[PDB]
């Protein structure tokens, strides 16, 4: 049981109406392993990305679910000011249902010094899974023993 | 007893009676910044 998920990214001046294929994500429900495989960006795409960063635009990510459409927006100014570091997280139910995803960047700054062409070559991403957690109940058995003892 | 300049006992008694009469009260604030370890000193009756 291995299923592929489609991951698209957005890149425009101020609006967002164009979506392109970035890579393939493999997810295996029974094990719980999540793998990413995305292609490298071209020089023109890198230049457009740099131009968008100086325009404090928005980085929308589309992940269709088998239908539903989940989108997540992240500031790219901090992405360009710092090193490329995205963190992806899938949200699932108790069964095979998809809630949504969130993209989070560890630096999360706004200083904005400079970006070098050496920096934006490789994509640094990590995919994680967050299944629902079961809350605890009343621990009365220990209280009864403590009262008895 | 050991009478040694007895002026502290009367003032202590007067302060104790004044504090006993006034249980929960706020008289005035001091402009000086004070630490939180003197709070049991100062309030002594306010929760």
């Amino acid at each position: 049981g291995t299923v592929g998920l489609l991951l698209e990214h957005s890149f425009e001046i101020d609006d967002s109406a164009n979506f392109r294929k970035r890579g393939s994500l493999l997810w295996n429900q029974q094990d719980g392993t999540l793998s990413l495989s995305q292609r490298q960006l071209s020089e023109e795409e890198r230049g457009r990305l740099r131009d968008v960063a100086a325009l404090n635009g928005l980085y929308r990510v589309r992940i269709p679910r088998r239908g539903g459409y989940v989108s997540s927006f992240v500031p790219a100014c901090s992405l360009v000011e710092s090193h490329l570091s995205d963190q992806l997280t899938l949200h699932v139910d108790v069964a095979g249902n998809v809630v949504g995803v969130s993209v989070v960047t560890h630096p999360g700054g706004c200083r904005g010094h400079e970006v070098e062409d050496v920096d934006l070559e490789l994509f640094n991403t990590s995919v994680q899974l967050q299944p629902p957690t079961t809350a605890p109940g009343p621990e009365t058995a220990a209280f009864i023993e403590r009262l008895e003892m | 007893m050991k009478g040694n300049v007895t002026n502290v006992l009367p003032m202590i008694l007067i302060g104790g009676w004044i504090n006993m009469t006034f249980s929960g009260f706020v008289t005035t604030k001091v402009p000086f910044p004070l630490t939180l370890r003197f709070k049991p000193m100062l309030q002594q009756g306010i929760e």
Partner: protein, 249 residues
């Protein structure tokens, strides 16, 4: 499916001579803008079905301030039958754009209640003392919504009760908690940083009381300007259970 808006006086009772027309489809949602303009009056804007913003106090300075803020206001709409939690934001002058989207399967879970944070709430202490003398900082979020979902199927054992903690600014679930033997009327109260929600257990006939609290670490962040775009951290969540012999209407 008509929507109307009235402008009256709470002191005397007579209504004022200012009233805006309403057209298109019925008004969807509205929020109160803290910013004030004209004389000393606040701004109220409403959302229609066509995904457009309509401002009640039409004023040149009102529009100037709104255009100055521009990407500063977000909008989250929640549907029960649709089971779709999608978000929008204002761009430039007046236009709706999708930012964050969430879908929940209606057949499995169903939305019941959604509570948020009160606008008129000020926090005195932003931290707490700990064992020796070391300080502990809290996690206060002015923009955070908690949604409550219940199981559609009702059974003696199979019951699903859970709460989702999402940020209305950026789609991101902070903590998602799930019960296994809870059913019936569920009451949720939101506060400074602690959530109080009650339920009933089918296994043992009783009402369990779960208190959830968010806590940060020992070191603080910027602590000058708060924003949900930044702050890439996950706060600690604490849960406890008690017994309350009542119904809690």
């Amino acid at each position: 499916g008509m929507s109307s808006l009235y402008v009256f006086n709470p002191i005397f009772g007579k209504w004022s001579q200012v009233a805006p027309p309403v057209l298109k489809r019925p008004i969807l949602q509205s929020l109160l803008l803290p910013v004030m303009d004209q004389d000393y009056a606040k701004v109220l804007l409403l959302i229609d079905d066509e995904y457009k913003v309509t401002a009640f106090p039409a004023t040149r300075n009102v529009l100037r301030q709104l255009h100055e803020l521009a990407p500063s206001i977000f909008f989250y709409l929640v549907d029960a039958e649709q089971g779709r939690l999608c978000g929008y934001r204002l761009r430039k002058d007046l236009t709706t754009e999708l930012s964050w989207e969430l879908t929940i399967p209606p057949e499995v879970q169903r939305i019941v209640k959604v509570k948020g944070k009160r606008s008129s709430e000020h926090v005195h202490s932003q931290g707490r003392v700990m064992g020796d003398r070391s300080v502990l900082y809290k996690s206060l979020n002015p923009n955070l919504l908690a949604v409550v979902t219940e199981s559609t199927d009702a059974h003696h054992e199979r019951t699903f009760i859970g709460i989702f903690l999402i940020d209305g600014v950026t789609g991101r679930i902070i903590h998602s908690s799930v019960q296994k033997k809870a059913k019936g009327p569920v009451h949720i109260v939101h506060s400074e940083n602690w959530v109080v929600y009650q339920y009933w257990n089918t296994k043992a006939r009783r009402n369990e009381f779960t208190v959830l609290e968010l806590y940060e670490g020992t070191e603080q962040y910027n602590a000058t300007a708060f924003s949900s775009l930044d702050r890439p951290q996950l706060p600690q969540v604490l849960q406890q259970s008690y017994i309350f012999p009542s119904s809690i209407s």
